Design a protein around this ligand. Structure first.
Ligand SMILES: CCCCCCCC/C=C\CCCCCCCC(=O)OC[C@H](COP(=O)(O)OCCN)OC(=O)CCCCCCC/C=C\CCCCCCCC
Ligand SMILES: CCCCCCCCO[C@@H]1O[C@H](CO)[C@@H](O)[C@H](O)[C@H]1O
Ligand SMILES: CCCCCCCCO[C@@H]1O[C@H](CO)[C@@H](O)[C@H](O)[C@H]1O
Lengths: 112, 101, 48, 61
């Protein structure tokens, strides 16, 4: 028993949402994600490549409107958000593949 | 004797907004006076009202009501706005009266 | 008075079946979409 | 599992979904009409011209 590495019970993923609203907060945060494959899977290499295409942004990227990332460009051209990031968080048997952005209350919809 | 009180408490239950967990003042039609009063409510009272109302709209869409235990009881209904509203109206009538003179 | 009599009823039959089928189908779809709001749960969490 | 097969083959790609509706309609019509007419006539045995037609259809004068 002592030298056997325990296998954890699998965690079920659920398409769903949680909305914590506080209009008193200056900017909104939003994160969206689908279930990832988990450490072992090779596809993670492709997912990471994919995340690189979309990439990330933040109001201090000097590249501005000429950034290669389309989402970054639009973000700049339309002042869509303060920042955004893609991610591929892995775990043993699962993971989260998504993105998170910070935007002003009135640009959330266009950003999304 | 306690007739007026028997009637009120009766109407209160007949109305039934207490089944949605709403306070009498939660059910007021928001005309101008009521809108001004609401702007004067302290933050906590305003957020409590907002949750109560949102909660009622959700029950309403679901076609459910709160469990009998959670119903607002006649004597525990807090007339949180009536005070502000009466003041708002007092001010209005003062100005109206004054602008005629 | 009404030569269409037979065709009218044959049509009525078709209208009913399709009506029964289509109505059920649409009922499910309305329900499906609304399920999101129907089962939705909320809570009031003030810094209290 | 048909549901999964259906999903993968028909309902996943919006293009195949439309194709399934069209081809689905074409087959539904052919079937649905035949059945309706069939039901209607059975419920009206010997009342329609289709039924009595033979009596004068090349068997008189
Ligand atoms: C013989 C007949 C053959 C020829 C007929 C050609 C007609 C074919 C039509 C093209 C196929 C439609 C393609 C739809 C694709 C778009 C789509 O997303 O589906 C519709 C979309 C569903 O969304 P999702 O469930 O999320 O689907 C996601 C798919 N991954 O929207 C709908 O709900 C539409 C379907 C419901 C129709 C409701 C209409 C109710 C009307 C009834 C009354 C009768 C009509 C009388 C017409 C009056 C004319 C004067
Ligand atoms: C007139 O004839 C009608 O023609 C229709 C076909 O157009 C049939 O469906 C009707 O039953 C028939 O009475
Ligand atoms: C709710 C939608 C109802 C639409 C029902 C469409 C059915 C009409 O079907 C009709 O049946 C008649 C009798 O066979 C035929 O003569 C007509 O050509 C045909 O169009």
């Amino acid at each position: 028993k002592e030298d056997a590495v325990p296998i954890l019970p699998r965690c079920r993923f659920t398409g769903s949402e949680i909305r914590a609203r506080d209009d008193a907060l200056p900017v909104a945060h939003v994160a969206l994600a689908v279930e990832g494959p988990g450490w072992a899977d090779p596809d993670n290499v492709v997912l990471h490549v994919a995340n690189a295409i979309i990439g990330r942004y933040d109001r201090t990227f000097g590249g501005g409107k000429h950034l290669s990332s389309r989402l970054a460009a639009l973000a700049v051209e339309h002042k869509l958000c303060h920042s955004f990031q893609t991610f591929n968080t892995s775990y043993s048997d699962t993971g989260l593949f998504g993105f998170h952005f910070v935007a002003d209350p009135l640009s959330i919809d266009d950003m999304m | 004797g306690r007739l007026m009180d028997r009637i009120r408490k009766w109407y209160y239950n007949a109305a039934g907004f207490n089944k949605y967990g709403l306070m009498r003042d939660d059910t007021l039609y928001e005309d101008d006076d009521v809108k001004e009063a609401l702007k004067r409510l302290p933050e906590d009272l305003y957020n409590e009202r907002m949750f109560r109302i949102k909660r009622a709209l959700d029950l309403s869409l679901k076609h459910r009501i709160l469990p009998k235990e959670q119903w607002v009881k006649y004597e525990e209904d807090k007339p949180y706005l009536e005070p502000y509203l009466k003041e708002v109206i007092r001010e209005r009538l003062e100005r109206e009266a004054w602008n005629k003179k | 008075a009404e030569p269409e009599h037979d065709q009218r009823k044959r049509m009525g039959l078709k209208m009913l079946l399709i009506s029964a089928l289509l109505t059920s189908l649409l009922y499910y779809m309305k329900r499906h979409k609304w399920s999101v709001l129907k089962s939705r749960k909320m809570a009031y969490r003030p810094p209290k | 599992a048909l549901l999964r097969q259906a999903y993968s083959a028909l309902f996943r790609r919006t293009s195949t979904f439309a194709l399934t509706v069209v081809l689905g309609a074409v087959l539904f019509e052919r079937a649905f009409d035949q059945g309706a007419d069939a039901i209607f006539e059975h419920l009206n045995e010997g009342k329609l011209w289709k039924h009595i037609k033979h009596k004068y259809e090349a068997s008189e004068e």
